[PDB]
Design a protein around this motif. Structure first.
Motif, PDB file in Angstrom:
ATOM      1  N   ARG A 271     -30.998-147.088 -72.816  1.00  0.00           N
ATOM      2  CA  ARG A 271     -31.506-148.376 -72.357  1.00  0.00           C
ATOM      3  C   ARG A 271     -30.721-148.883 -71.156  1.00  0.00           C
ATOM      4  N   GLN A 272     -29.389-148.818 -71.223  1.00  0.00           N
ATOM      5  CA  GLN A 272     -28.574-149.328 -70.127  1.00  0.00           C
ATOM      6  C   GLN A 272     -28.688-148.443 -68.891  1.00  0.00           C
ATOM      7  N   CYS A 273     -28.525-147.132 -69.059  1.00  0.00           N
ATOM      8  CA  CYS A 273     -28.588-146.192 -67.944  1.00  0.00           C
ATOM      9  C   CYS A 273     -30.040-145.774 -67.743  1.00  0.00           C
ATOM     10  N   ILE A 274     -30.673-146.307 -66.698  1.00  0.00           N
ATOM     11  CA  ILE A 274     -32.093-146.075 -66.461  1.00  0.00           C
ATOM     12  C   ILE A 274     -32.306-144.735 -65.771  1.00  0.00           C
ATOM     13  N   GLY A 275     -31.218-144.017 -65.504  1.00  0.00           N
ATOM     14  CA  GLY A 275     -31.313-142.743 -64.820  1.00  0.00           C
ATOM     15  C   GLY A 275     -32.124-141.719 -65.583  1.00  0.00           C
ATOM     16  N   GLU A 276     -33.263-141.311 -65.017  1.00  0.00           N
ATOM     17  CA  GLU A 276     -34.107-140.322 -65.681  1.00  0.00           C
ATOM     18  C   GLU A 276     -33.364-139.006 -65.868  1.00  0.00           C
ATOM     19  N   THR A 277     -32.651-138.556 -64.834  1.00  0.00           N
ATOM     20  CA  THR A 277     -31.752-137.422 -65.012  1.00  0.00           C
ATOM     21  C   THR A 277     -30.600-137.790 -65.937  1.00  0.00           C
ATOM     22  N   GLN A 278     -30.087-139.018 -65.815  1.00  0.00           N
ATOM     23  CA  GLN A 278     -28.971-139.450 -66.653  1.00  0.00           C
ATOM     24  C   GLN A 278     -29.357-139.484 -68.127  1.00  0.00           C
ATOM     25  N   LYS A 279     -30.571-139.949 -68.436  1.00  0.00           N
ATOM     26  CA  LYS A 279     -30.989-140.060 -69.832  1.00  0.00           C
ATOM     27  C   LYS A 279     -30.952-138.705 -70.529  1.00  0.00           C
ATOM     28  N   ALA A 280     -31.600-137.698 -69.940  1.00  0.00           N
ATOM     29  CA  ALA A 280     -31.536-136.352 -70.497  1.00  0.00           C
ATOM     30  C   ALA A 280     -30.140-135.758 -70.385  1.00  0.00           C
ATOM     31  N   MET A 281     -29.303-136.311 -69.509  1.00  0.00           N
ATOM     32  CA  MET A 281     -27.928-135.864 -69.345  1.00  0.00           C
ATOM     33  C   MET A 281     -26.949-136.689 -70.171  1.00  0.00           C
TER      34      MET A 281
ATOM     35  N   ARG B  24     -21.885-132.152 -74.761  1.00  0.00           N
ATOM     36  CA  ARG B  24     -21.836-131.426 -73.490  1.00  0.00           C
ATOM     37  C   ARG B  24     -21.268-132.353 -72.414  1.00  0.00           C
ATOM     38  N   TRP B  25     -19.956-132.572 -72.502  1.00  0.00           N
ATOM     39  CA  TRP B  25     -19.243-133.446 -71.584  1.00  0.00           C
ATOM     40  C   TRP B  25     -18.811-132.730 -70.307  1.00  0.00           C
ATOM     41  N   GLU B  26     -19.444-131.603 -69.976  1.00  0.00           N
ATOM     42  CA  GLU B  26     -19.171-130.956 -68.698  1.00  0.00           C
ATOM     43  C   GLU B  26     -19.676-131.797 -67.535  1.00  0.00           C
ATOM     44  N   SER B  27     -20.750-132.551 -67.748  1.00  0.00           N
ATOM     45  CA  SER B  27     -21.264-133.493 -66.767  1.00  0.00           C
ATOM     46  C   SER B  27     -20.669-134.885 -66.932  1.00  0.00           C
ATOM     47  N   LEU B  28     -19.672-135.036 -67.807  1.00  0.00           N
ATOM     48  CA  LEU B  28     -19.025-136.331 -67.984  1.00  0.00           C
ATOM     49  C   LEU B  28     -18.369-136.798 -66.690  1.00  0.00           C
ATOM     50  N   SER B  29     -17.680-135.890 -65.992  1.00  0.00           N
ATOM     51  CA  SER B  29     -17.189-136.206 -64.655  1.00  0.00           C
ATOM     52  C   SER B  29     -18.345-136.441 -63.693  1.00  0.00           C
ATOM     53  N   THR B  30     -19.418-135.656 -63.827  1.00  0.00           N
ATOM     54  CA  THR B  30     -20.629-135.917 -63.057  1.00  0.00           C
ATOM     55  C   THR B  30     -21.217-137.277 -63.411  1.00  0.00           C
ATOM     56  N   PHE B  31     -21.148-137.656 -64.691  1.00  0.00           N
ATOM     57  CA  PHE B  31     -21.634-138.972 -65.095  1.00  0.00           C
ATOM     58  C   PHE B  31     -20.852-140.073 -64.396  1.00  0.00           C
ATOM     59  N   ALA B  32     -19.534-139.900 -64.276  1.00  0.00           N
ATOM     60  CA  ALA B  32     -18.741-140.800 -63.448  1.00  0.00           C
ATOM     61  C   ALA B  32     -19.227-140.770 -62.004  1.00  0.00           C
ATOM     62  N   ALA B  33     -19.423-139.569 -61.456  1.00  0.00           N
ATOM     63  CA  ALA B  33     -19.986-139.457 -60.116  1.00  0.00           C
ATOM     64  C   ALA B  33     -21.381-140.068 -60.062  1.00  0.00           C
ATOM     65  N   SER B  34     -22.174-139.870 -61.118  1.00  0.00           N
ATOM     66  CA  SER B  34     -23.470-140.534 -61.197  1.00  0.00           C
ATOM     67  C   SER B  34     -23.309-142.046 -61.287  1.00  0.00           C
ATOM     68  N   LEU B  35     -22.359-142.517 -62.101  1.00  0.00           N
ATOM     69  CA  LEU B  35     -22.154-143.955 -62.254  1.00  0.00           C
ATOM     70  C   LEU B  35     -21.882-144.622 -60.914  1.00  0.00           C
TER      71      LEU B  35
ATOM     72  N   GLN C  45     -30.441-132.078 -59.670  1.00  0.00           N
ATOM     73  CA  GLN C  45     -31.348-133.150 -60.063  1.00  0.00           C
ATOM     74  C   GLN C  45     -30.591-134.446 -60.317  1.00  0.00           C
ATOM     75  N   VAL C  46     -29.424-134.356 -60.959  1.00  0.00           N
ATOM     76  CA  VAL C  46     -28.572-135.532 -61.112  1.00  0.00           C
ATOM     77  C   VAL C  46     -28.145-136.048 -59.744  1.00  0.00           C
ATOM     78  N   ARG C  47     -27.706-135.139 -58.867  1.00  0.00           N
ATOM     79  CA  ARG C  47     -27.390-135.526 -57.496  1.00  0.00           C
ATOM     80  C   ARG C  47     -28.629-136.026 -56.767  1.00  0.00           C
ATOM     81  N   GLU C  48     -29.794-135.444 -57.068  1.00  0.00           N
ATOM     82  CA  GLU C  48     -31.037-135.928 -56.476  1.00  0.00           C
ATOM     83  C   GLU C  48     -31.296-137.376 -56.868  1.00  0.00           C
ATOM     84  N   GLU C  49     -31.221-137.678 -58.168  1.00  0.00           N
ATOM     85  CA  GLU C  49     -31.328-139.067 -58.601  1.00  0.00           C
ATOM     86  C   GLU C  49     -30.155-139.894 -58.096  1.00  0.00           C
TER      87      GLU C  49
END
Lengths: 404, 201, 201
Positions: A182-192, A200-211, A362-366
């Motif tokens: 609900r909070q993170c509206i990221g379509e790539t983020q949601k599935a991520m 699968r916290w390999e994208s956890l640093s990416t999630f910070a980069a996404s944040l 795709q995360v970088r795309e979003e």
């Protein structure tokens, strides 16, 4: 939601002064109100954490002669009301929703003065992104009461705590994960964020980069702090989505009766901005906008050294405030991404064309979708004295933050 | 508890004879009774396992001339009666408690005939403990209706099974742990069952 | 093609009412028919996906008093007919070809109410292309039965699935690729569909 707010603020202040005035604790010192309110708020949900009688740091002295000491207080008269308000029908079940709002806002001053990053460090991500880690340290009952107000990273930390803590965990997780989506509206983020669900916290640093790129929605409600509530004598029009909060606590600043505590008098502007930071949740909001909205520059934490100990903090001046603009608190996504004609008619009309022409990707795309965005927010700001929509003139302190 | 027992026995025999006598299945052969009764308990709890018409091994023959053969039978008359007894108030909710005992006792002979130790081997313990693994292979609804009859090892297996594989799981977990605690009266056994619920064996 | 359809809609309708009326499920609510029919459709093709006995969401109430509750139902009578109808000569082999039409049509409402784009997102293409992504979520045998009705993108997804997944692998792809070209009548589309066959995107 806002129906019981006008009456909810009244009895919060009722126990705020009774505990202090019983033992002659002056309410014109913030630190006296900060600790007392923390004691009062402790009894609201974490009923077993505080003591019925205990010693706490306040400012004892008549007319500016206050020196810190520990004064016993009889919390027992104030304990009975808090537990009975939990299931009182007069609140229509909004007590926990209100308390979750109340608990989160009142713990801001300690974090600003003592700059810590409890969530991002435990999430092994960038420390500059504690902005998305709102709602840490709150009771789990309140964290399930207004999880929307609790930042995703705290839920993500709770999700990380959840995976690092019995299939009954799912009931807690569905609230934790559901309010992450609900909070993170990221379509790539949601599935991520779903990748973070089983670990699968390999994208956890990416999630910070996404944040950094995609900014989750942070539901907020304009709730005053302990010193202002005790100093606020009007609660008739007390709601959560208008200018009443902006206008009410301006009058407190006009009274100039509340005093702030800090290591030295250079901090007088800092806490004067902390009150601005805490009331409207404008800690991570742009300082240039903050300077423009409130007509005054905001001192960053870098401008001051380590906050001295609570025992050795001293009254350094009066509380002052001014503002010119406001807005409804954030409800939906601030960064919202929400041009080609499709001829549906076999008839002839002039066609108009308004256009001239890996999972990490795709995360970088979003992520690029939100950097490429040039409009944030949902509707607008408003000016002081009404709900007239006001648009940016801009400010020089843009890209500058309290911890930026 | 025993108030509804007399009325259950009479119609069980009535349906026992109805299915057997419909297709000329004599009831003086145990295998005819066991197989038909196996069809009977199939309609009682797990109504979807047995076919409405199916061929089963029966002893067909008049006056001792029974020979092994598969005879198709019609179970639909028995199916309708059994399903209506599931929530019939005339039993005061004792239908599932009564049916759990029937499933355990009748499947016991099949375990006697073919000596197997499923629960103990799955619980990596001595094979001489399957006596404490009574009530294995029974319906979970029966295993919740009469859990005291279901042996602790089966519940311990189900405790192990539950960990191996949902708010309703609690009512499956806490009960199964509770049946383990209720069945095992040992002061040391009760707590040492709880550590099985944690996940260490 | 349409020769069997007159009689073929009859026993399809017959099974819908038999299951609902057995457990007093009114058929004048859309949600009752939507849930019941999906179970029957599961019985028709995916015989191993549905449960013979289970509780689903229905509207129980007489004359406008319908409310959400879960009522256990028995699908076993519909299972035998459905599996026997898979190879029933009465349909002239049109069972699965019509069923692939049936499952595609009946799953449309859930997609509309819950706006999702599974195929296009998995195909890293535009979201507005789900108009060409018909036939997703259907049984693999059903997709073979009516691949023309299955949209090119689902076949493209299955083409991408097969390129991102044994002598049976090519047979699936060639039917997909051939119907991919058959659906996409574009001559340039067909060639660049053939370029998708080697795996380039």
């Amino acid at each position: 939601t806002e129906s019981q707010i006008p009456k909810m603020y009244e009895m919060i202040r009722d126990q705020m002064r009774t505990l202090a005035s019983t033992h002659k604790i002056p309410l014109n010192i913030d630190h006296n109100c900060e600790v007392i309110g923390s004691i009062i708020m402790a009894a609201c949900t974490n009923n077993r954490d505080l003591r019925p009688v205990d010693k706490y740091w306040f400012l004892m002295g008549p007319a500016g002669a206050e020196v810190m000491t520990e004064v016993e207080i009889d919390i027992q008269p104030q304990l009975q009301w808090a537990k009975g308000a939990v299931h009182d029908p007069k609140y229509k079940g909004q007590w926990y929703p209100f308390l979750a709002l109340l608990q989160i806002s009142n713990k801001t001053k300690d974090t600003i003065l003592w700059q810590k990053y409890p969530v991002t460090q435990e999430l092994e991500i960038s420390n500059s992104l504690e902005i998305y880690a709102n709602g840490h340290g709150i009771k789990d009952r309140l964290k399930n009461s207004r999880p929307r107000s609790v930042g995703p990273l705290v839920h993500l930390l709770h999700l990380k705590r959840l995976q690092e803590n019995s299939p009954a965990v799912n009931g807690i997780r569905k609230s934790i994960v559901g309010h992450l989506k609900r909070q993170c509206i990221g379509e790539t983020q949601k599935a991520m964020i779903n990748q973070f669900e089983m670990g699968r916290w390999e994208s956890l640093s990416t999630f910070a980069a996404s944040l950094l790129a995609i900014k989750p929605r942070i539901e907020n409600h304009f709730v005053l702090t302990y010193p202002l509530i005790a100093n606020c004598e009007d609660f008739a029009g007390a709601t959560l989505s208008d200018e009443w909060v902006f206008k009410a606590m301006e009058k407190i600043s006009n009274k100039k009766t509340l005093r702030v505590c800090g290591p030295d008098e250079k901090w007088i502007s800092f806490m004067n901005q902390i009150y601005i930071h805490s009331v409207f949740q404008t800690t991570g909001e742009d300082l240039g906008v903050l300077e423009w909205v409130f007509g005054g520059r905001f001192c960053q934490r870098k401008e001051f050294g380590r906050y001295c100990k609570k025992s050795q903090t001293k009254v350094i001046g009066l509380f002052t405030f001014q503002y010119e603009y406001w807005s409804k608190p954030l409800k939906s996504a601030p960064r919202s991404i929400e041009i080609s004609c499709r001829p549906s008619f076999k008839g002839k009309r002039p066609s108009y064309n308004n256009f001239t022409s890996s999972f990490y990707d795709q995360v970088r795309e979003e992520c690029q979708k939100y950097m490429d965005l040039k409009v944030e927010g949902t509707t607008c700001f408003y000016r002081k004295g009404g709900h007239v929509e006001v648009e940016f003139p801009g400010s020089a302190h843009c890209n500058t933050y309290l911890f930026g």
